[PDB]
Design a binder for this molecule. Structure first.
Ligand SMILES: Cn1cc(-c2cncnc2N)c2ccc(Cl)c(Cl)c21
Length: 327
């Protein structure tokens, strides 16, 4: 840091670390000290290739949507330095995860959620049109355009509030075209779809599951899947949404998870009781039974349909009642 790359970008600060490497903030000395973000990919095969893929994906999408009408991050250039791939991006604000966290996990206000959601659904339906599936949607990969605030007070402390809740989607290193190889395991665990967990094959619907999981988190301020074990994650889905359908059970080869034709889960085990305590039927999560909240929850529920063929598409989701107050 103070390190110069490409003889124009001076690292000032670190914005993010990760599997792939890091994202830093740089001053661009040839663009009148204006500021950008640079992703510095680890010098490691699987990350260079995800980065190579990210770049091809993002050139296609810059070609198709040069003005980020569909809210993907804009890549400005790429180069190499000490055999790290380096991707220059427009400078964004905080992730939606970082923002919530830095508010003490105070959920987002429903008006901001409606909007943020609409943008995320717009962005990813645009990928789904170009035969891409993101595979790793989560609040860490949805970032505010800038995250500026008002230090307003409240009697249930000094929270920050969103003037402008515009988002972009980031992280296209895992985005998979329909005609390409599909990795066996995608998504971060808490945002991962049952078809992925059961190894049924996946495609575009898996992103919709993830989106459902994100909206729940924006609303609750915490995850409804607080787990790192696959079977328990399934037991949690059941407690929140009812039994898995027979034909998904019949079709999976993850036999380990099942006894006779039912999840091999003892509800009265220690793990059983942890699930019963942290998880309950979806709608019992609602903090008010007014009309708007019933609509969010009708959507979420549709995004959390077990059967990927039956699950709502983002085409359909973009015409959900929940989205009216926007026009
Ligand atoms: C802080 N930050 C993190 C990423 C990022 C990259 N890849 C995978 N997950 C991520 N979160 C990222 C991508 C573009 C931009 Cl402009 C910023 Cl400011 C970014």
């Amino acid at each position: 840091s103070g390190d110069v790359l490409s003889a124009r970008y001076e690292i000032v600060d670190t914005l993010g670390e990760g599997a792939f490497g890091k994202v830093v903030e740089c001053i661009d000395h040839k663009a009148g000290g204006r500021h950008v973000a640079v992703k510095i990919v680890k010098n490691v095969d699987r990350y260079c290739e995800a980065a190579r893929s990210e770049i091809q994906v993002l050139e296609h999408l810059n070609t198709t949507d040069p003005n980020s009408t569909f809210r993907c991050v804009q890549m400005l250039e790429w180069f190499e330095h000490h055999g790290h791939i380096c991707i220059v991006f427009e400078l964004l604000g905080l992730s939606t995860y970082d923002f919530i966290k830095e508010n003490g996990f105070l959920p987002f206000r429903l008006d901001h959620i409606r909007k943020m959601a609409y943008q995320i659904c717009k962005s990813v339906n645009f990928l789904h049109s170009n035969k891409l599936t993101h595979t790793d949607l989560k609040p860490e990969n949805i970032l505010f355009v800038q995250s500026d605030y008002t230090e307003a007070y409240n009697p249930k402390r000094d929270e920050r509030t969103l003037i402008n809740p515009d988002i972009k989607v980031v992280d296209f290193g895992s985005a998979t075209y329909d005609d390409e190889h599909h990795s066996t395991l995608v998504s971060t665990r808490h945002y991962r779809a049952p078809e992925v967990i059961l190894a049924l094959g996946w495609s575009q619907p898996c992103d919709v599951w993830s989106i459902g999981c994100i909206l729940i988190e924006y609303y609750l301020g915490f995850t409804v899947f607080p787990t790192h074990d696959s079977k328990e994650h399934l037991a949690m889905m059941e407690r929140i949404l009812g039994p898995l359908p027979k034909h998904m059970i019949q079709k999976t080869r993850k036999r380990k998870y099942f006894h006779h034709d039912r999840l091999d889960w003892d509800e009265h085990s220690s793990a059983g009781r942890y699930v019963s305590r942290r998880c309950k039927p979806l709608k019992e999560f609602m903090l008010s039974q007014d009309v708007e909240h019933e609509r969010l929850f009708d959507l979420i529920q549709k995004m959390l349909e077990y059967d990927p063929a039956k699950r709502i598409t983002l085409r359909e989701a973009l015409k959900h009642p929940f989205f009216d107050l926007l026009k």
